[PDB]
Design an enzyme around this catalytic site. Structure first.
Site, PDB file in Angstrom:
ATOM      1  N   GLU A 232       0.834  -1.193   0.000  1.00  0.00           N
ATOM      2  CA  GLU A 232       0.000   0.000   0.000  1.00  0.00           C
ATOM      3  C   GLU A 232       0.876   1.253   0.000  1.00  0.00           C
ATOM      4  OE1 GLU A 232      -3.288   2.506   2.500  1.00  0.00           O
ATOM      5  OE2 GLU A 232      -3.042   0.386   3.043  1.00  0.00           O
ATOM      6  N   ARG A 310      -7.863   3.252  13.920  1.00  0.00           N
ATOM      7  CA  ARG A 310      -8.654   2.045  13.699  1.00  0.00           C
ATOM      8  C   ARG A 310      -8.585   1.131  14.934  1.00  0.00           C
ATOM      9  NH1 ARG A 310     -11.596  -0.693   9.814  1.00  0.00           N
ATOM     10  NH2 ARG A 310     -11.204   1.060   8.383  1.00  0.00           N
ATOM     11  N   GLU A 691     -10.589  -8.182   5.204  1.00  0.00           N
ATOM     12  CA  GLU A 691      -9.906  -8.061   6.481  1.00  0.00           C
ATOM     13  C   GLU A 691     -10.711  -8.538   7.673  1.00  0.00           C
ATOM     14  OE1 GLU A 691      -9.408  -3.698   5.792  1.00  0.00           O
ATOM     15  OE2 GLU A 691      -7.381  -4.061   6.609  1.00  0.00           O
TER      16      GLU A 691
HETATM   17  N1  LIG Z   1      -5.407 -13.218  -2.098  1.00  0.00           N
HETATM   18  C1  LIG Z   1      -5.380 -12.048  -1.397  1.00  0.00           C
HETATM   19  N2  LIG Z   1      -6.429 -11.681  -0.636  1.00  0.00           N
HETATM   20  C2  LIG Z   1      -6.391 -10.485   0.063  1.00  0.00           C
HETATM   21  C3  LIG Z   1      -5.183  -9.629   0.033  1.00  0.00           C
HETATM   22  C4  LIG Z   1      -4.091 -10.109  -0.814  1.00  0.00           C
HETATM   23  O1  LIG Z   1      -2.993  -9.452  -0.921  1.00  0.00           O
HETATM   24  N3  LIG Z   1      -4.260 -11.292  -1.454  1.00  0.00           N
HETATM   25  N4  LIG Z   1      -5.108  -8.415   0.739  1.00  0.00           N
HETATM   26  C5  LIG Z   1      -6.108  -8.271   1.805  1.00  0.00           C
HETATM   27  C6  LIG Z   1      -6.252  -6.850   2.315  1.00  0.00           C
HETATM   28  S1  LIG Z   1      -5.012  -6.251   3.300  1.00  0.00           S
HETATM   29  C7  LIG Z   1      -7.278  -6.065   1.954  1.00  0.00           C
HETATM   30  S2  LIG Z   1      -7.432  -4.504   2.596  1.00  0.00           S
HETATM   31  C8  LIG Z   1      -8.296  -6.521   0.952  1.00  0.00           C
HETATM   32  C9  LIG Z   1      -8.387  -5.463  -0.139  1.00  0.00           C
HETATM   33  O2  LIG Z   1      -9.162  -5.930  -1.216  1.00  0.00           O
HETATM   34  P1  LIG Z   1     -10.740  -5.583  -1.364  1.00  0.00           P
HETATM   35  O3  LIG Z   1     -10.835  -4.110  -0.975  1.00  0.00           O
HETATM   36  O4  LIG Z   1     -10.978  -5.864  -2.842  1.00  0.00           O
HETATM   37  O5  LIG Z   1     -11.292  -6.571  -0.385  1.00  0.00           O
HETATM   38  O6  LIG Z   1      -7.941  -7.790   0.368  1.00  0.00           O
HETATM   39  C10 LIG Z   1      -7.482  -8.747   1.348  1.00  0.00           C
HETATM   40  N5  LIG Z   1      -7.456 -10.101   0.803  1.00  0.00           N
HETATM   41  O1  LIG Z   2      -5.030   1.986   4.011  1.00  0.00           O
HETATM   42  C1  LIG Z   2      -5.339   3.050   4.572  1.00  0.00           C
HETATM   43  C2  LIG Z   2      -4.626   4.303   4.273  1.00  0.00           C
HETATM   44  O2  LIG Z   2      -3.877   4.362   3.139  1.00  0.00           O
HETATM   45  C3  LIG Z   2      -4.985   5.551   4.999  1.00  0.00           C
HETATM   46  C4  LIG Z   2      -4.323   6.876   4.692  1.00  0.00           C
HETATM   47  C5  LIG Z   2      -4.328   7.931   5.607  1.00  0.00           C
HETATM   48  C6  LIG Z   2      -3.775   9.188   5.299  1.00  0.00           C
HETATM   49  C7  LIG Z   2      -3.205   9.419   4.047  1.00  0.00           C
HETATM   50  O3  LIG Z   2      -2.638  10.613   3.704  1.00  0.00           O
HETATM   51  C8  LIG Z   2      -3.198   8.313   3.064  1.00  0.00           C
HETATM   52  O4  LIG Z   2      -2.663   8.517   1.822  1.00  0.00           O
HETATM   53  C9  LIG Z   2      -3.760   7.096   3.419  1.00  0.00           C
HETATM   54  O5  LIG Z   2      -6.026   5.497   5.899  1.00  0.00           O
HETATM   55  C10 LIG Z   2      -6.752   4.363   6.206  1.00  0.00           C
HETATM   56  C11 LIG Z   2      -7.783   4.367   7.132  1.00  0.00           C
HETATM   57  C12 LIG Z   2      -8.468   3.174   7.431  1.00  0.00           C
HETATM   58  O6  LIG Z   2      -9.469   3.171   8.322  1.00  0.00           O
HETATM   59  C13 LIG Z   2      -8.206   1.942   6.850  1.00  0.00           C
HETATM   60  C14 LIG Z   2      -7.201   1.838   5.913  1.00  0.00           C
HETATM   61  O7  LIG Z   2      -6.934   0.622   5.358  1.00  0.00           O
HETATM   62  C15 LIG Z   2      -6.433   3.068   5.553  1.00  0.00           C
HETATM   63  O1  MOS Z   3      -6.188  -2.236   4.223  1.00  0.00           O
HETATM   64 MO1  MOS Z   3      -5.358  -3.924   3.490  1.00  0.00          MO
HETATM   65  O2  MOS Z   3      -4.202  -3.159   2.490  1.00  0.00           O
HETATM   66  S1  MOS Z   3      -4.098  -3.849   5.150  1.00  0.00           S
END
Ligand SMILES: Nc1nc2c(c(=O)[nH]1)N[C@H]1C(S)=C(S)[C@@H](COP(=O)(O)O)O[C@H]1N2
Ligand SMILES: O=c1c(O)c(-c2ccc(O)c(O)c2)oc2cc(O)cc(O)c12
Ligand code: MOS
Ligand SMILES: Cc1cc2nc3c(=O)[nH]c(=O)nc-3n(C[C@H](O)[C@H](O)[C@H](O)COP(=O)(O)OP(=O)(O)OC[C@H]3O[C@@H](n4cnc5c(N)ncnc54)[C@H](O)[C@@H]3O)c2cc1C
Ligand code: FES
Ligand code: FES
EC number: 1.17.1.4
Lengths: 756, 334, 164
Positions: A232, A310, A691
């Site tokens: 990310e 979070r 998640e």
């Molecule tokens: N196979 C697979 N599933 C996964 C992931 C991945 O890297 N691979 N990432 C997870 C995470 S961290 C998130 S936030 C969600 C994001 O995808 P979505 O928003 O399409 O659920 O996928 C989840 N499931």
């Molecule tokens: O993945 C995330 C993330 O990127 C950011 C974030 C915050 C400030 C920034 O300036 C930015 O570029 C991203 O917030 C989040 C807040 C959530 O509740 C859940 C998430 O998963 C994210």
């Molecule tokens: O919000 Mo999933 O990329 S940890």
């Protein structure tokens, strides 16, 4: 209409044939070079010299890059508190100092090894306790408070206080970080192929480093071999370096990290330390809760603040607590900066919550299910942050899981096993979860799509989301097909790119299906509206007929769609406004057997019931529940990162870091999606699944704790209401040490000791 | 979620053919090959005589069979060996030979070949003769994967001499015999505490190669167990693993010989010699358990700063493992 | 003064006249032969992403033998007169998928897909050795293969159909 059908992942046949292309699989240009990062071996030091004389002797050596080579800016990272390349000082063992460029990846490796660095050490801070002692934090304290704590603590029959630690986690995506950067040689133009969840930030950070407008940088993402949050933001550590090598040499350049580099440099899940105090009634009813959370953020801010927010949002799990105060502090330390990892602070705070809840039930000497149930929110209750729980389905998940897992009969069998066995014990636990759906930063809750219908009637969909295995593209095609009322075979998604949909949020927060679903759906409605006159003129014609008539009438078959999640915006000053759009819920029951003599354990059976609204694809969603659960089982039991006293990571490959294996999963592993619970708030009544289930892997941790309690009733003492601390992960070492007996105490040698 | 009834059936006769050209080349008499790299020269030895001449000519030369350890050394520890000899082709270093006192394996034999051979022995021989074999198999059970076991050689594990080798403790406790050769010299020695003098060293001269390893049959009144820690947190230290052996005086519970050998408690495989020497002529009972546990606590004691940490857990395992052995032996006896 | 190295990949002869002893089979497949189905997951033998099948005529056994191996650790110089089968050796969407490929795909045993070739090759190798394996042999086949996405259940369930 395939929505609700178990359609396989569209790339699955190609993945099984080895035909699916990941970043490093892309063919190399004839002139393409390879980069290898040069990295700090000290937690905290002044850089006194870098010596490249021996690396220059390596066949194929091209150049060494450092901060002096950067044409634009050396300041990077989400809060601009990082360097691309460290200049005078390093602040963690994986800290990037420079990079070697060579003609093969073997030569890049060879030359990087032989780059010599001289340092002068500075006072380092590695542990949370180091950072607390030294006042080493990012920012000020975060807090959510509701009710009246002093009042709550006075009305309590019982108070339990304590401290708890949860270790961090390495993403261990099977595909490591990888970028190819192609310099065009005109106008600063560059095209990058990247394994990243965040093409927007990649594009910005590269532009920033090069000192060129963002419109010159194109970033394309076909697919990732796993992301899990680790791609990310931390992907840019490799992308920006490769872009620089491409800029400087004028050749295409790539880098794919070896596993050992990736685990060292790119950061993991935040370890948390919690200090807690709960007030409860002899009934098990909670009246007061105070938790101070501390995360190990490492050597930059990155996403740490949002991860802590979070965590505070989830310190209640599924429990109504009238008087509550949660605080969070981010620890500034000389470790690689920690980042998003599936769950995003939620699992840490939910773990803390289940821990004090487990101790409440033990203190009251009541069955844990009963104490959980008693304390569970009801439909329409407000959370500690004053959000209304509408469509609160945990009660339903709980009942069906108890029934289908045969919890109560199995509880008897575990008791009978423990009565018959001395050096092995069984444990059984059932646990709920709730997980808020939305980015807690309101501005990220926006999504775009771009759809083209070509004159043969075939459709090309592009959206801001990236595929990392979760089957996002699969779901977006199923959505587009239902919306357009055409077969899926007419629709295609190729990749994600910044020149088709700009300014995309990272693929994260589990909300991608929801938000890109809506953007795609809206684009599809636009297309439908434009085709409507042709359909009216030719109601028995084909899709292909209507498309061609529209083309011939000079009606555009190309459009954007956009969605912006409504009614979001939580305020810490008023403790008010919606932080989340809705919540995803689930319940897991797990049973384990421990070997009290060795600390080894076996996962016997797990049952899960998950509320995913009306699934768009039950096969994909069941896959996500199973995959997320197993990552949580890893977080809480198997996976353990370990550092030298000097802050150097020891565990840097599968030989010393153990993620779940085929042989790790519960022998009987059952997952059900809750029936007849449509979610009015999201695309086609579905709910986010990425998640939310990962915390359910803690059911295994708490079954283990139950088993240990049995071991301790057997051999350590007679105190049935004893509270011992068990930190996560509960590795063999921790399990064995907790089963205090004649061997741990050395009483078996004839010595006096602290067992019965 | 899916329908198995629609799957394409398997057709074992329709598989990709084994390359006929390769098949024709099997008639070609094997000969020594030389490969030359930017940094390394590799000799593929075809005969034992060749290997021994090569070793005398270049004692610094590095043997490679499966490369599962050398590959790691080169990649991750930046070690370079300018001259490598691969003896995988040599018939003697691959020979599996049954004998009066045990089963002999050439040093190049893959761990999967050892495992197959021992599983065969165990299923066919009386339990009382397979005690050491079952120990080896227990160590091989949750050991890597099929890929590593198909190429990792028996001799490579022994000579790597990792403090946390799961095999060397079993070979030490059972006095497994090692036949070691150079141009001229030939000597067989039982593996004992002196075979591993220091970290990652064995008692070999620079020109010697391990030829073969004979894993013994167990005798009457002889029992064996092997155990291991199911966690590993450091590259090559602090994972407890052991071979344990007891011989009784005929028909009795009176100790004639006792061997407790341990990995993960020092910078090499070690024997609890002080402790076991004091149980000779003693009877297999609670008093022996107490006394062995007291000797183990003392002899294998770790300083608080011991490399690998887990100080308490590791001491506890050395004792808890002996306890399992003690109870198992009682079950095998009584 | 250096000999030619000769081996086979997917039924095709490779004649390497300038073998560097440092070269791993994985590097050779990916970066010389352009066969990128075989993946790098760790380079240290833990993950099996690089899993291939090797076959040879064993002159001491007088037999053709088939076994799996980690390409990341196999030096090409050990492979004189050896045959390599990679995931592309066994089936393709462009021709026909092997039943191993079809079942893992259709049973939802592939999410990200990066581990899938390594797992396919572990399953393929088992079936090449034992056309009728037990459930137990099937679970054992994969001690060397890691998957981060799927939690393993659907892979074993798809593959269980091959047993008895
Ligand atoms: N196979 C697979 N599933 C996964 C992931 C991945 O890297 N691979 N990432 C997870 C995470 S961290 C998130 S936030 C969600 C994001 O995808 P979505 O928003 O399409 O659920 O996928 C989840 N499931
Ligand atoms: O993945 C995330 C993330 O990127 C950011 C974030 C915050 C400030 C920034 O300036 C930015 O570029 C991203 O917030 C989040 C807040 C959530 O509740 C859940 C998430 O998963 C994210
Ligand atoms: O919000 Mo999933 O990329 S940890
Ligand atoms: C992922 C994986 C998991 C593993 N798990 C375990 C485990 O759980 N327990 C355990 O104990 N080990 C484990 N190992 C180690 C493994 O068993 C050894 O690496 C392997 O047996 C070494 O044999 P090789 O043929 O591959 O040796 P090589 O790497 O080719 O050589 C090893 C060393 O032995 C020398 N040598 C080889 N043959 C001879 C000979 N006959 N005479 C003299 N010297 C010789 C070589 O010069 C070299 O120094 C694991 C390895 C991997 C990669
Ligand atoms: S790449 Fe991980 S085992 Fe070879
Ligand atoms: S499908 Fe992603 S690692 Fe297995």
């Amino acid at each position: 209409d395939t929505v609700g059908r178990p359609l396989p992942h569209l790339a699955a046949a190609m993945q099984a044939s080895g035909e699916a292309v990941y970043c490093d699989d892309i063919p190399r240009y004839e002139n393409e070079l390879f980069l290898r990062l040069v990295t700090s071996t000290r937690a905290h030091a002044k850089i006194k010299s870098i010596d490249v004389s021996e690396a220059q002797k390596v066949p194929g050596f091209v150049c060494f890059l450092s901060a002096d080579d950067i044409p634009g800016s050396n300041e990077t990272g989400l809060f601009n508190d990082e360097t691309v390349f460290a200049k005078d000082t390093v602040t963690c063992v994986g800290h990037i100092i420079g990079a070697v460029v060579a003609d093969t990846p073997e030569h890049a490796e060879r030359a990087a090894h032989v780059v010599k660095v001289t340092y002068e050490d500075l006072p380092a801070i590695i542990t949370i306790e180091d950072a607390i002692k030294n006042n080493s934090f990012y920012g000020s304290e975060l807090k959510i408070e509701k009710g009246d704590l002093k009042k709550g603590f006075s009305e309590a029959d019982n108070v339990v206080s304590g401290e708890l630690y949860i270790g961090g986690q390495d993403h261990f995506y099977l595909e490591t970080h990888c970028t190819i950067a192609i310099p065009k040689g005109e106008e600063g133009e560059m095209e990058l192929f990247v394994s990243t969840q965040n093409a927007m930030k990649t594009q910005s950070f590269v532009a920033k480093m090069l000192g060129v407008p963002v419109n010159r940088i194109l970033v394309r993402v076909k697919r990732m071999g796993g992301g899990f949050g680790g791609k990310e933001t931390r992907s840019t550590l490799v992308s920006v370096a490769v872009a620089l090598a491409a800029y400087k040499t004028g050749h295409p350049v790539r880098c794919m990290l070896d596993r050992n580099e990736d685990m060292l440099i790119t950061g993991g899940r935040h370890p948390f330390l919690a200090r807690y105090k709960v007030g409860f009634m002899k009934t098990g009813t909670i009246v007061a809760l105070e938790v101070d959370h501390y995360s190990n953020a490492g050597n930059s801010r990155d996403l740490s603040h949002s991860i802590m927010e979070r965590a505070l949002f989830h310190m209640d799990n599924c429990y109504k607590i009238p008087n509550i105060r949660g605080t969070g502090r981010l620890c500034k330390t000389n470790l690689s900066s920690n980042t998003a990892f599936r769950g995003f602070g939620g699992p840490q705070a939910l773990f803390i919550a289940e821990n004090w809840m487990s101790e409440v039930a033990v203190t009251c000497g009541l069955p844990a299910e009963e104490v959980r149930w008693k304390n569970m929110y009801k439909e329409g209750d407000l959370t500690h942050f004053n959000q209304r729980l509408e469509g609160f389905s945990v009660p339903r998940c709980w009942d069906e899981c108890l029934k289908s897992s045969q919890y109560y009969a199995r509880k008897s069998e575990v008791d009978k096993f423990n009565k018959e066995n001395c050096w092995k014990k069984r444990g059984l636990c059932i646990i709920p979860t709730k997980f808020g759906i939305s980015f807690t930063v309101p501005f990220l809750n926006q999504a775009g799509a771009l759809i083209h219908v070509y004159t043969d009637g075939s459709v090309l969909v592009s959206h801001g989301g990236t595929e990392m295995g979760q089957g996002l593209h699969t779901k977006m095609v199923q959505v587009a097909s239902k919306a357009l009322k055409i077969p899926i075979s007419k629709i295609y998604i190729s990749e994600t790119s910044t020149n088709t949909v700009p300014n995309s949020s990272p693929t994260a927060a589990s909300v991608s299906t929801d938000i890109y679903g809506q953007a795609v759906y809206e684009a599809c409605q636009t297309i439908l509206k434009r085709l409507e006159p042709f359909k009216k003129k030719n109601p028995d014609g084909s899709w292909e007929d209507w498309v061609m008539a529209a083309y011939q009438d000079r009606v555009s078959l190309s459009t954007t769609g956009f969605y912006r999640t409504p009614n979001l915006g939580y305020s810490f000053e008023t403790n008010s406004g919606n932080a989340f759009h809705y919540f995803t819920y689930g319940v897991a029951c797990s049973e384990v057997e421990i070997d009290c003599l060795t600390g080894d354990h076996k996962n016997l059976r797990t049952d899960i019931v998950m509320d995913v609204g009306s699934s768009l694809n039950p096969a994909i969603d069941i896959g996500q529940v199973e995959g997320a659960f197993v990552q949580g089982l890893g977080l809480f039991t198997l996976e353990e990162l370990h550092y030298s006293p000097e802050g150097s990571l020891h565990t840097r490959g599968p030989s010393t870091y153990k993620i779940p294996a085929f042989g790790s999963i519960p022998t009987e592993f059952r997952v059900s999606l809750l029936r007849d619970c449509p979610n009015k708030k999201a695309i086609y009544a579905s709910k986010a699944v990425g998640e939310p289930p990962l915390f359910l892997g803690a059911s295994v941790f708490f079954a283990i704790k139950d088993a240990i309690r049995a071991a301790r009733a057997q051999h350590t003492n007679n105190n049935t209401k004893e509270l011992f601390r068990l930190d996560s992960p509960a590795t063999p070492e921790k399990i064995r040490n907790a089963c205090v007996d004649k061997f741990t105490t050395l009483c078996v040698t004839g010595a006096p000791g602290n067992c019965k | 979620l899916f329908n198995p009834e629609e799957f394409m059936p398997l057709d074992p006769t329709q598989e990709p053919i084994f390359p006929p050209e390769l098949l024709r080349l099997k008639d070609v008499p094997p000969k020594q090959l030389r490969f030359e790299g930017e940094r390394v020269t590799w000799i593929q030895a075809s005969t034992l005589k060749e290997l021994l001449d090569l070793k005398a000519q270049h004692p610094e030369a590095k043997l490679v069979v499966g490369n599962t350890e050398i590959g790691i050394e080169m990649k991750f520890k930046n070690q370079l060996f300018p001259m490598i000899i691969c003896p995988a082709w040599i018939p003697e270093l691959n020979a599996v030979e049954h004998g009066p006192e045990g089963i002999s394996f050439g040093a190049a034999c893959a761990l999967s070949s050892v495992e197959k051979t021992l599983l065969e022995a165990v299923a066919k021989l009386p339990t009382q003769k397979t005690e050491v074999f079952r120990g080896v198999l227990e160590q091989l059970r949750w050991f890597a994967g099929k890929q590593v076991k198909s190429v990792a050689s028996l001799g490579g594990n022994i000579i790597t001499a990792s403090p946390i080798s799961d095999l060397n403790p079993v070979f030490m406790a059972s006095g497994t015999k090692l036949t070691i050769v150079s141009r001229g010299t030939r000597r067989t020695v039982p593996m004992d505490h002196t075979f591993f003098p220091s970290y990652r060293k064995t008692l070999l001269g620079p020109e010697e190669i391990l030829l073969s390893i004979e894993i013994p049959y167990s005798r009457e009144d002889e029992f064996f167990s092997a155990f291991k820690q199911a966690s590993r947190r450091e590259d090559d230290i602090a994972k407890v693993t052991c071979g344990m052996r007891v011989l009784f005086q005929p028909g009795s519970m009176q100790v004639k010989e006792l061997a407790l050998c341990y990995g993960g408690m020092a910078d090499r495989t070690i024997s609890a010699l002080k402790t076991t020497q004091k149980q000779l002529s003693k009877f297999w009972n609670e008093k022996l358990l107490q006394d062995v546990c007291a000797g183990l606590a003392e002899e294998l004691s770790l300083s608080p700063d011991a490399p690998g940490g887990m100080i308490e857990f590791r001491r506890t395992l050395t004792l808890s493992f002996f306890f399992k052995f003690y109870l198992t032996v009682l079950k095998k006896l009584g | 003064t250096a000999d030619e190295l000769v081996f086979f990949v997917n039924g095709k002869k490779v004649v390497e006249k300038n073998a560097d002893p440092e070269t791993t089979l994985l590097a050779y497949l990916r970066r010389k032969l352009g066969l990128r189905g075989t993946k790098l997951g760790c380079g240290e033998g833990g993950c099996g992403a690089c899993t291939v099948m090797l076959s040879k005529y064993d002159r001491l056994q007088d037999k053709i033998i088939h076994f799996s191996a980690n390409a990341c650790l196999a030096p090409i110089c050990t492979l004189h007169h050896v045959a390599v089968t990679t995931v592309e050796g066994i089936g393709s969407t462009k021709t026909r998928l092997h039943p191993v490929q079809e079942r893992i795909a259709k049973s939802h045993g592939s999410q990200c897909g990066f581990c899938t070739p390594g797992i396919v090759m572990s399953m393929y190798t088992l079936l090449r050795n034992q056309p009728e394996p037990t459930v137990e042999e099937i679970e054992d086949a994969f001690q060397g293969n890691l998957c981060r996405c799927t939690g393993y259940r659907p892979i074993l369930q798809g593959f269980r159909t091959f047993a008895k």
